[PDB]
Design a protein around this ligand. Structure first.
Ligand SMILES: *[C@@H]1O[C@H](CO)[C@@H](O)[C@H](O)[C@H]1NC(C)=O
Ligand SMILES: *[C@@H]1O[C@H](CO)[C@@H](O)[C@H](O)[C@H]1NC(C)=O
Ligand SMILES: *[C@@H]1O[C@H](CO)[C@@H](O)[C@H](O)[C@H]1NC(C)=O
Ligand SMILES: *[C@@H]1O[C@H](CO)[C@@H](O)[C@H](O)[C@H]1NC(C)=O
Lengths: 213, 203
């Protein structure tokens, strides 16, 4: 079977999970764990060479840090989690170039274990048809879109400073990932927002400023 | 530099090359010969007809490139690409040989992609709304947009049941009379036309 896929939104932090799910307390045993995170970027794809792997993070087992600064400072580890057996990678800005395979090797006192993921990075946008700048009483269709190919499981719409929930109503028709405003009014000018949730739990938050003249 | 000719991928296009005021005998101008060269974006000849008025008969041969012999008799030596393909973009050079006259033509062909974007893009239920976008990949924006409905291509104007804005057509409430083909024509400032058809399916 293939690698589990983790999705990221470009510009937003992402968390690549690698965790002992049954840590039997013992913060003093799991203090002493260390991990190597390696990244296999996409070659793009006969008698081919094997894909290359380079180390993006290394923290030493034993319960100490050596004073070595991070090699790739946008890639990070939460050091509070190591006591709980959490060796997950944080990509502070998830970048397009960060896509590819991630391989963790964790060395504890008695054993070593591995974690393997494929990270894909997508782009979010509110697509406005005909446009975002509108005239009074025009119609507009907003699509809460993300470049992931599959269909999200839920879409939540919000409007205004305080994120007031937006439901199917006479002034707002909701269908799939789309919100149709049949007749914009002065109260429709301002910020709108959406949250897309996919079946793997990945969710995207998108904001957009509608202008009505 | 060169005149630009636009093409829609999947639709025929003709690269114009016509004698200015070509009113000679239709059997005199058929006896002309022409060479069309394409340097893709390495000049190579894509079709050559020899002067003298006789043919090799290989018109089914390479039918993606063609000359219309009615235009050849009318002094029109234009190249026809029956499916305009992505590979056809690039530089074109025509040379036409008559007994006492010569002509050369130089054009740049760019090919764009057309699509009817439907939101939502599936099959629709009666009384749903739907938005159609007549889109073309050309960078400049078209100067006019025309919408048509049905096999008989009846024009569609701004109304309560069909709202037109820019390149978009909104149908607020589909009915069984909306089932079937819809079409749009984009017209650009040079006269280039893009025709897109779309089959709406509604239960
Ligand atoms: C609208 O957004 C959804 C979610 O990303 C996407 O699957 C769909 O293709 C988009 N459609 C248009 C017309 O933008
Ligand atoms: C997305 O899912 C995560 C995981 O449960 C959750 O913490 C987050 O709150 C969800 N999205 C939003 C917009 O809150
Ligand atoms: C709709 O089509 C026009 C014409 O090419 C294009 O400029 C515009 O970006 C398209 N918008 C959407 C949402 O498809
Ligand atoms: C291009 O399309 C427009 C609108 O349908 C039409 O008026 C015009 O005559 C067309 N041009 C040609 C050369 O057919």
């Amino acid at each position: 079977k293939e690698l589990p896929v983790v999705w990221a939104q470009e510009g937003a932090p992402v968390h690549l999970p690698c965790s002992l799910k049954s840590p039997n307390l013992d913060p003093n045993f799991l203090r002493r764990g260390g991990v190597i995170w390696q990244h296999q970027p996409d070659s793009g794809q006969p008698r081919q060479p094997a894909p290359g792997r380079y180390t993006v993070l290394s923290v030493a087992p034993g319960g100490l840090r050596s004073g070595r600064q991070p090699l790739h400072p946008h890639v990070q580890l939460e050091e509070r989690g190591l006591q709980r057996g959490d060796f997950s990678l944080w990509l502070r800005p998830a970048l397009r170039t960060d896509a590819g395979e991630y391989h963790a090797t964790v060395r504890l006192p008695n054993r070593a274990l591995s974690c393997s993921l494929r990270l894909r990075v997508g782009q979010a946008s509110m697509i406005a048809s005909p446009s975002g700048v509108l005239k009074l009483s025009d119609w507009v269709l907003l699509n809460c879109s993300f470049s992931r190919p599959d269909r999200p499981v839920s879409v939540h719409w919000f409007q205004g400073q305080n994120r007031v929930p937006v439901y199917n109503s006479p002034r707002h028709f909701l269908a799939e990932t789309f919100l149709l405003l049949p007749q914009v009014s002065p109260l429709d000018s301002g910020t709108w927002g959406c949250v897309l949730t996919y079946r793997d739990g990945f969710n995207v938050s998108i904001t957009y400023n509608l202008k009505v003249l």
